[PDB]
Design a protein around this ligand. Sequence first.
Ligand SMILES: [Zn+2]
Ligand SMILES: [Zn+2]
Ligand SMILES: [Zn+2]
Ligand SMILES: [Zn+2]
Ligand SMILES: [Zn+2]
Ligand SMILES: [Zn+2]
Ligand SMILES: [Zn+2]
Lengths: 76, 90, 451, 93, 89
Amino acid sequence: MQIFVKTLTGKTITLEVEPSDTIENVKAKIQDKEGIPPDQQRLIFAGKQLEDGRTLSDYNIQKESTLHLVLRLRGG
Amino acid sequence: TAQLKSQIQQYLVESNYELISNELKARLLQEGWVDKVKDLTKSEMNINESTNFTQILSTVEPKALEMVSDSTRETVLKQIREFLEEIVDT
Amino acid sequence: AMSICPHIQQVFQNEKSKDGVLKTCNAARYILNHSVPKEKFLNTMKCGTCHEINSGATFMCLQCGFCGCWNHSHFLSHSKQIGHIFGINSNNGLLFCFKCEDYIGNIDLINDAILAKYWDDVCTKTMVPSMERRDGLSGLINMGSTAFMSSILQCLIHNPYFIRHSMSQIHSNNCKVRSPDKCFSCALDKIVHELYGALNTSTNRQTGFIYLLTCAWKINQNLAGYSQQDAHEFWQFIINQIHQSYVLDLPNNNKQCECIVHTVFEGSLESSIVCPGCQNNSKTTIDPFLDLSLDIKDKKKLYECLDSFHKKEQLKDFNYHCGECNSTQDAIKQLGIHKLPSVLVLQLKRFEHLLNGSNRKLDDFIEFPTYLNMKNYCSTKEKGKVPDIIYELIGIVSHKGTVNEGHYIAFCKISGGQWFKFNDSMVSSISQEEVLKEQAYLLFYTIRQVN
Amino acid sequence: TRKESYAIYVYKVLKQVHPDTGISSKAMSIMNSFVNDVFERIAGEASRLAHYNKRSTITSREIQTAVRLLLPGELAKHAVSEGTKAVTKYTSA
Amino acid sequence: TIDSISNGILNNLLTTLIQDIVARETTQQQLLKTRYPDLRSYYFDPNGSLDINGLQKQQESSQYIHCENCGRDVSANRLAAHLQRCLSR
Ligand SMILES: [Zn+2]
Ligand SMILES: [Zn+2]
Ligand SMILES: [Zn+2]
Ligand SMILES: [Zn+2]
Ligand SMILES: [Zn+2]
Ligand SMILES: [Zn+2]
Ligand SMILES: [Zn+2]
């Protein structure tokens, strides 16, 4: 299935994925498109950050759903 | 007779009053008038060292009436007038 | 030496008269909470004498059924002619004495008249807020790298839904674990306790925060305050943990969670997919949200950023064949609002990624309004136009530093309309205009008017 | 004449960590040695880093990678965090 | 006249809203002043230095916190490090 990712600029990209695909794989695909490493990526869906080792299906993520991509602003 | 006015007002109620009241509130709120009136109230309370409602109101109301922007005033009047030409005979 | 109305003191000298009064006040307020707008206009804003609507304030008599206007002194006339000196303002339920020419706002019994039956007990078991704590104002010292946490917490500390939840004892009343070193909400209630009340019976008011920090260490040490982290990530993490605690305290086909987060913060986006030829369609997808993240480049105003956010996009990497025009097409995507939240949280995307793999902060000022209208962003029309939908700004988080290193500060607005700056241990007064000149990172908006 | 020493700042920190606890003169002396020593080790290896990277100036970046060379993992990491933290703190204020 | 009745409607709306707002303000301030006879306003410093009690930022690391864990007192600005060394049991 195809899903979408809304990047920092607001530009949306498309990925071809399965429900069982891991967050690592999706982040790898994002790295492959944007050239940004997974450790720099934050992937958001439904108010939650998506965690490595879990699958899309674990979060009830379906076809043509849109994930929202952000970075981190550190402050201490 | 002047029962007429009250009658007309009753009709106004049964029909749009909300739209007017709400648009008025939104306009006065958005342009900062409401908060200006809050600041004025705190200032007057501090100046007169009093929370007595009648005496504070006596000084607050005229100025607050003057502070209403011309834009909001003429727009809301224009709207009410638009609503009035519907249901009166001349 | 401020006095109290001697007339109500006089009535209250007799217990049954007092009870009649309080019963009527309670009944009236129940009515005010349970009457539709037109009935209210016709029966509480109609002058009994001139029959005008909204002839200034209209007052409902405490002793009879008469309603009387201000402009024609008609309640004033009811008071002069029948001897009924007490009337209720139909806009606020407040009780006026026409002898003092002043409202009674400073009698605790009257303000909380619904508890009158138990009032004695209420006075024996509990006290009014201490002046120092009454607004719950106190600073939270930096215990390492905790600026990303406390900045988030003060807006929560000043959220009426959260304060209503916490002060209601809901977790306390229902917690199955009942330990603040495990339960985040018990710890929060303890914080509320420390800030608004008094622990039985200088280092002051830090216990709850320390419990929260201990819980945080236990679940994710990296996010526990030793190291610098992202405030938005902390927001989603903590609200998710709170939600999890709600689910935990439950005794028990319900896709939507019923927790406090999801009844306050949850909305839904409508994503439409439409044929550029037929322009009819559409393929609609509904996505929940707890907050919105906005792009800011080449813009100067929040409305510009929301416009960009809400702007249609043509996908160039989506495989799409339209069945209505029978051809391969590049679909059009648009985000609009399906459902709004009661409290809207906004994150400005103040960063960009460079080709060399580095990031840069965007320090661009983005103008944000004291009041926000969402009407241009709602997806669904009525039998059309979408009505005005306005939020009030109640909170700001700002960042100073770079993408990989910095500092968070909070700004909160309280009653009377005054703003305060919350910088770790330091709470200070600040004007609205300067807050509005701040470089905003996070914004907190509460629903105010819905047309 | 003035013989400088880190005895007060170290005391301070002891109080920070064990307020009801005192330190002997000798223990202190030792500490002060450790400080001078590590000062040289760091400063020197930094000077080397500057030289090595044809650069006229020592920034905290130098001191960082220095830390990553001298120290084993966890020690280095923690030290780094603590440092860029206090740096941030100085910047903001 | 239409003009007159319209002016009266606007005046009605404005005076109603004003009387409501003012009544709310006066009742609130009356309450605050009565509840708290010695009431003082939170301090506002044009210089941006003093807190709501009119005080400056306190000296850290002069302050300390007693860590209920392990029984050690720890300087507050070094508390997190301690917890990392203390909670690791
Ligand atoms: Zn009248
Ligand atoms: Zn009566
Ligand atoms: Zn009286
Ligand atoms: Zn609990
Ligand atoms: Zn929920
Ligand atoms: Zn077509
Ligand atoms: Zn400890």
